[PDB]
Amino acid sequence: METIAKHRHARSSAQKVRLVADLIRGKKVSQALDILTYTNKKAAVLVKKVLESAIANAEHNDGADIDDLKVTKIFVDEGPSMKRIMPRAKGRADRILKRTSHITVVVSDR
Amino acid sequence: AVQQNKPTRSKRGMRRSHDALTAVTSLSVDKTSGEKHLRHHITADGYYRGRKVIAK
Amino acid sequence: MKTFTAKPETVKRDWYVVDATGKTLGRLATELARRLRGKHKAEYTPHVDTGDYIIVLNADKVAVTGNKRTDKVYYHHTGHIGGIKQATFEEMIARRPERVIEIAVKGMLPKGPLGRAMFRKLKVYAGNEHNHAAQQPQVLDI
Amino acid sequence: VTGSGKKPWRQKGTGRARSGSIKSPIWRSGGVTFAARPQDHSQKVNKKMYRGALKSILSELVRQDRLIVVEKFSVEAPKTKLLAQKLKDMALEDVLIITGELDENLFLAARNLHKVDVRDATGIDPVSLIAFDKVVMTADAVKQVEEMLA
Amino acid sequence: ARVKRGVIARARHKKILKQAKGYYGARSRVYRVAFQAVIKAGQYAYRDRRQRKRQFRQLWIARINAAARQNGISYSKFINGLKKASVEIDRKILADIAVFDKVAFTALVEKAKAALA
């Protein structure tokens, strides 16, 4: 029985999440969680709260038991980017694009 | 330099694919605790061959 | 109506052994080249490479014939040193003998992809030192 | 387009567009190059031509048998429900009413009726006349339309 | 009359880009390149209406040649022999006996060889 946790509008570039996210993809929940506690990267704490919320809602609510739970998907999508002008030398007025992420976790027993 | 044309999306994928994050070759848990591990390092509670590390 | 066409699986191929000691370079070369495509036999298809698996038994004793010999110097520029570099046909037959006949059929096959696909069916080895007793080679005279 | 003749300009021949004007129609939005002008398409109208299309449709109105031509059709009052009850007696629906006398007790009627309109016969409107189911008419109106067509 | 402009092109676009299903990179997702690709496409297809036929006709000669050469006549002598022998319309796509069941073909070749001068 399946549960979605999302974190939308998250403070990450998405290429740096996907490095970590694809690692624990198809891993089963408990091995995935062990691997994640000792990854220091900003991406790994961002994912932690959303991985736990998924697992935690499986341990309750519409879910029942977690021993046969596995993390079928961990993926990341374009969130709304905010545009800002960075001040710089010889009157250069370039764009810095502040990325956010749409993080989707799915766990199921299925 | 500069460039000739806007490049294909298959090119972007090849250049970052080998630079992608590499496997841990599974993980460890302790011989000596109900603590989980980090392999050939010492945990936050100091368990590996005891003593103590990270008194934070 | 439509035409019939070949499929990769129907090809017979078979192994043909050419004694080359009675032959001379270009009459061996262009017949071998004809057979290395399969243009002696019926192809009836634009896109499958048929051919034989072709042994030249020897070709160490292949004449080029006549006065072309003493000005036949196999031109190349692989990448170094002022000048062309060269080798006479005689050095090329007396030492490592395969190559006179090898770069004689090379230019008889088309461009890139089809020309690599036609070539890999041939072997010459050094000459008169063949290992091809067990297949029962079908003899062919040129 | 008002409120500036400015040229954004700063030459042409600098790896970009002419940047031409701050009032140019092409400047994203606010005014376009061929936007509509006032139209008044009315003419002289040639009288022998006008009256000769009206003869063509006036014959057809008889060939399609739509002209009832009621003798002195009128109502007591300009009340819609009375005029409408008159037309029900006459077993007529969705009709062009022609008044022959522009009498105010018929002219101020019929307003409540969905598909009824009332006009006077003097220069009878030919675009109205091909529409509607029937033409109710008076004989005094048939007289003054033939003299306008004479 | 404010007219929208582009609700007619949305269909011309979707016709091009559907024809431009199967194509590489920008060609299946940008009208501009799709449009280019589609136009070269029909130049090659209209070429190949005539050209496909000329191109197979070579294989037609070439399978008849190899039967004939095995039957001790050269192809150009067989066709001029076959011409000198009486009437027959024939056709180059006829000789399935060129590639396979090659026991046959011998009678046409004997007839032609006889008639040759």
Added chain:
Amino acid sequence: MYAVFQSGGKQHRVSEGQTVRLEKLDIATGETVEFAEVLMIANGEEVKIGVPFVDGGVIKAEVVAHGRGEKVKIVKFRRRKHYRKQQGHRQWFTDVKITGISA
């Protein structure tokens, strides 16, 4: 026995029980096709014959579909001249099914 006959300005080989396509006929689905213009029959061995439309031959058949094909596209185009034009065509056909070719 496999056989050849003439469909129009083009010649067509066919077998027994073989369904074949050719340029459109007047003849319909519910009607009879028969071909006296047979150029040879390839018999038990190769035939040595001179004169085609062999009299001691027929292919009898029947129509199995009369339709019109797929749409091909025709492009006439010239760069630098701003010259682009198009035509479509589908081409008609008839399917015949051959039961014939006599022993």
Added chain:
Amino acid sequence: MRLNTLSPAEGSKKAGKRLGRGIGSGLGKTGGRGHKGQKSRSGGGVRR
């Protein structure tokens, strides 16, 4: 109703050129004015 059944005399309606619509259209680019010179350009210069 008889409304809406009227039509021009045979051949009476010339319709006129719109220009500039489509590129496989024959009419399009240039305007029926050809390459370069004053009469291809926008309306100006010489007096009658």
Added chain:
RNA sequence: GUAACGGGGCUAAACCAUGCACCGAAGCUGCGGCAGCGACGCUUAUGCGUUGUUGGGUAGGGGAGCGUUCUGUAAGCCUGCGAAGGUGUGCUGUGAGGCAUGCUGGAGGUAUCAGAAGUGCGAAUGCUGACAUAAGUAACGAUAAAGCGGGUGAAAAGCCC
């Protein structure tokens, strides 16, 4: 860098002299479709049958048709008893186009026929937005750098002590 037969190869597989063959273009021709119009036959107000030279085409003319916005019949009539819009496919026409239909959608729509026009973008080193691109490349602001113990805290090489 052969690279002055197009290349391989050829001392006859050359060249010359004489002659024969073949292949080889939307050409030349047959098949099936079609454009406009002459000749002729039925025989006309309009047309239809047979035949036919003809139909590569810019600049450029000339005739027609289509959709997009809009008007009139449409004060009527279809519609949650499923309207507009979105999208994939089949079917279909010379093309523009048209029609069928699963998914979608929760109210609007409509011929016939003629007519008005802010009437189809793909280019203007054109204007705006959403958003790609080189790229996870380059950047760490005079290197007045920093350490280690405890702590606000889930978290500290930059904070507080």
Added chain:
RNA sequence: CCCGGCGAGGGGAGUGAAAAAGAACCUGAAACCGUGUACGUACAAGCAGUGGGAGCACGCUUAGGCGUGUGACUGCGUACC
């Protein structure tokens, strides 16, 4: 009601005709990046298309030479404005 930075975001339970109307909420393309599936890529080569095509999944192939999508290989082949 669950995870959490005293946070962000989403799911669980309940509202509604409808949340496949959940509050940046109308239905929703195209660029854009990512997920998911089939098939392909280590005799490998230039407008990336065309002409021929093994193979393979799916449609009970209506098994009656078929549809769909892809495709090793390989003749031909120089963009538009």
